[PDB]
Structure formats: C-alpha cells, structure tokens
C-alpha cells in the first residue's frame with residue numbers, strides 16, 4: 001500500500017481558480033473549538049488514497 | 051498573477067496627467083488581503 005499520496009476531504013469554501021491550499025488546520029464540523037486535536041465534529045481534512 | 055505598473059517623476063498631490071507603463075509581472079497564485087509599507091530610518 002502506498003500511503004504517500006493524499007487528498008483533501010473538508011473545506012469551508014470552494015477554491016478560486018488557480019489556487020493552492022497548504023493549510024492543515026483541523027476542520028470544525030460543529031460549533032465547539034477543535035483545539036488542534038482530533039475529536040467529535042473535528043476531522044483532519046487530509047486523507048490518504050492508499 | 052501579480053502585476054505592477056509604475057512611474058517616476060521629479061516634482062498634496064499635484065494637478066496633471068501622466069500614464070503608467072507596465073514593468074513587473076509575477077506568477078504568484080496567492081490570496082492577498084492586507085499589506086504594509088517598509089521604511090528606512092536614518093540613524094544618528
């Protein structure tokens with residue numbers, strides 16, 4: 001399995017043309033702060049194709 | 051794209067007309083919202 005390549009799963013707004021996102025901040029699904037830790041309504045936007 | 055036009059002249063802004071020629075293009079691809087100016091202090 002090749003876990004090197006990754007894609008993005010969650011984002012607040014759609015990317016503008018010819019734009020790149022390098023931000024890795026924890027996506028806030030709910031209203032409580034994520035506090036930089038994975039948890040409820042808090043998922044890492046980067047996923048692995050594998 | 052980041053495009054910069056400029057003009058220079060030896061002189062409240064004065065009353066006159068002068069067009070600006072393009073001189074810089076930079077293929078950046080960035081989201082810009084804010085900026086700042088940089089000074090050069092004269093040390094005693």
Ligand SMILES: *[C@@H]1O[C@H](CO)[C@@H](O)[C@H](O)[C@H]1NC(C)=O
Pocket residue numbers: 013014015016019081082083
């Ligand atoms: C650009 O940055 C501003 C900063 O507040 C943000 O609101 C906006 O969504 C960003 N746009 C894109 C296309 O990333």
